[PDB]
C-alpha cells in the first residue's frame, strides 16, 4: 500500500526513510495511549512500514516485541524485513554496561538482534542524578563490542552536536551509522546535517513537526499557515506531508510519532513529489533556531549537547522507571 524508500548506511545496510515512533512523552510518563500505539503499529506494518524506533527509556519494548512477533506469525513480515532500533540510556555509559542494557532490551523485544542501537544522549548520569563524567568515547567502545558480538547490525548516536560528532569520528574504530537529532522547519541544523552527510552518517530526525502540531508563543508555521497550505495545494498534499517530504528531500530520515491510523497512512504518502527551488526556499525561511526539545535539567552535566542558557533537579521519570 505505501512504498517507503531506503537510505544506505555507512556499514552496507539500508534504513527506511520513514520510521514509526514509539515514545509517548512525559506529560508524569503517559501510558494511556499504549493500546492505540500498538494497534496503529500493527496497521503501519500492514500498510508497509518496516522501520520501528524505540528505546529502553520509552517503556514499551515488551509490547512492541509482542506486536512484531504477531505480525511475523500472521505472515505479514519476516524479521529480516523489519528495521528495529533501540537505545541505551544515561546510566549505562560504562563500556561493559552497553551489553547489559542492550541484551535486556533485546529480551524485552523478543529478538536475537536489533538493526540499530544508539547512544540515547552523550551525557553519563547515574539513576540518582550524579554526573559520572564518563567520556562518550568509553561508551562507544561498548557499542563497538556489542556490534562485534552480533547484538546489533549497526551502531549510532543520538543528540550529538557537531563537536561531539567530530571527536567521535576522529577517535572511533567503527563510525556511527546515524546521528538521531531534532530536525524540523524551525530547527534545520544545517551545519550539523551537512557535517554528518559529508562524513556519510545518516541523519534521523525526531520531532520532525516541531511545534507545528497542537501537542504556546511558539513560532510559525502553524497548521493553518497560508504558505504551507499553498505549497500543499500546489503538489496535492497536506501541511504535515509537505514538512515530511521536505526532510526527505534533505536526505533526512523522519520518525514521526502518532497513534492515529489515518496519520500513519498520511505520513507515508510523501515520496511521489519533488519540491521546486521556490518552495524549498520558502520552507527554508522558517528556520530560526527554536528547539522543541531542550531538557534544561541536563545543562549542568558534562557533554550536554545544546547551547546553555545561563542562570536556571532531574525529574524522577527521566532517571528511574519500570518496563511493560
Ligand atoms: Ca532477531
Q: What coarse outline follows from CA principal-axis ratios?
A: globular
CATH 2nd-level architecture:
Alpha-Beta Barrel
Number of domains: 1
What proportion of the residues is helical, as a percent range? Answer: 25-40%
CATH superfamily: NADP-dependent oxidoreductase domain
C-alpha Rg (nearest Å) = 19 Å
Largest sheet descriptor: 8 strands, parallel
Tell me which ligands are bound.
calcium ion
Total beta-strand segments: 10
Strand line-up across the major sheet:
3-4-5-6-7-8-9-10
Oligomer: monomer
Class per helix and strand makeup:
alpha/beta
- In what range is the share of β-strand residues? 5-15%
CATH class: Alpha Beta
List the total number of helices: 10
N-to-C SSE string, H for helix and E for strand: EEEHEHEHEHEHEHEHHEHH
- State the CATH topology: TIM Barrel
Measured between the Cα atoms of the first and last residue, the distance is: 31 Å
Give descriptors for this structure.
monomeric; Lepidoptera; 324 residues; oxidoreductase; Uncharacterized protein; two-stranded antiparallel sheet; enzyme specificity; 10 strands; globular; binds calcium ion; 11% strand; alpha/beta; TIM Barrel; 8-stranded parallel β-sheet; monomer
Amino acid at each position: 500500500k505505501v512504498n517507503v524508500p531506503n537510505f544506505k548506511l555507512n556499514n552496507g545496510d539500508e534504513i527506511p526513510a520513514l520510521g514509526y515512533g514509539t515514545w509517548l512523552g512525559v506529560s508524569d510518563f503517559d501510558g494511556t495511549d499504549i493500546p492505540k500505539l500498538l494497534d496503529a503499529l500493527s496497521y503501519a506494518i500492514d500498510i508497509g512500514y518496516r522501520h520501528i524506533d524505540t528505546a529502553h527509556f520509552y517503556r514499551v519494548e515488551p509490547e512492541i516485541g509482542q506486536v512484531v512477533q504477531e505480525k511475523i506469525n500472521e505472515g505479514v513480515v519476516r524479521r529480516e524485513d523489519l528495521f528495529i532500533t533501540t537505545k541505551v540510556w544515561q546510566h549505562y555509559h560504562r563500556a561493559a554496561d552497553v551489553e547489559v542494557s542492550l541484551r535486556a532490551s533485546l529480551h524485552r523485544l523478543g529478538l536475537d538482534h536489533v538493526n540499530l542501537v544508539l547512544m540515547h544522549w552523550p551525557m553519563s548520569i547515574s539513576q540518582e542524578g550524579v554526573d559520572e563524567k564518563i567520556d562518550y568515547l568509553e561508551t562507544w567502545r561498548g557499542f563497538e563490542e556489542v556490534l562485534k558480538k552480533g547484538l546489533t547490525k549497526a551502531i549510532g548516536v543520538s543528540n550529538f552536536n557537531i563537536e561531539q560528532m567530530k571527536r567521535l569520528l576522529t577517535n572511533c574504530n567503527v563510525p556511527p551509522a546515524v546521528n538521531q537529532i531534532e530536525v524540523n522547519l524551525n530547527l534545520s541544523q544545517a551545519d550539523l546535517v551537512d557535517y554528518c552527510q559529508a562524513n556519510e552518517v545518516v541523519v534521523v530526525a525526531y520531532s520532525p513537526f516541531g511545534t507545528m502540531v497542537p501537542s504556546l508563543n511558539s513560532p510559525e508555521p502553524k497548521l493553518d499557515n497560508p504558505a504551507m497550505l499553498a505549497i500543499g495545494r500546489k503538489y496535492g498534499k497536506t501541511v504535515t506531508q509537505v514538512n515530511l517530504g521536505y526532510l526527505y528531500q534533505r536526505g533526512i530520515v523522519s520518525i514521526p510519532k502518532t497513534v492515529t491510523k489515518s496519520r500513519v497512512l498520511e505520513n507515508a504518502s510523501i515520496f511521489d513529489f519533488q519540491l521546486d527551488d521556490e518552495d524549498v526556499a520558502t520552507l527554508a525561511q522558517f528556520d530560526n533556531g527554536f528547539r522543541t526539545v531542550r531538557p534544561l535539567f541536563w545543562q549542568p552535566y558534562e557533554n550536554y549537547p545544546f547551547d546553555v542558557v545561563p542562570g536556571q533537579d532531574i525529574p524522577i521519570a527521566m532517571r528511574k522507571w519500570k518496563n511493560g
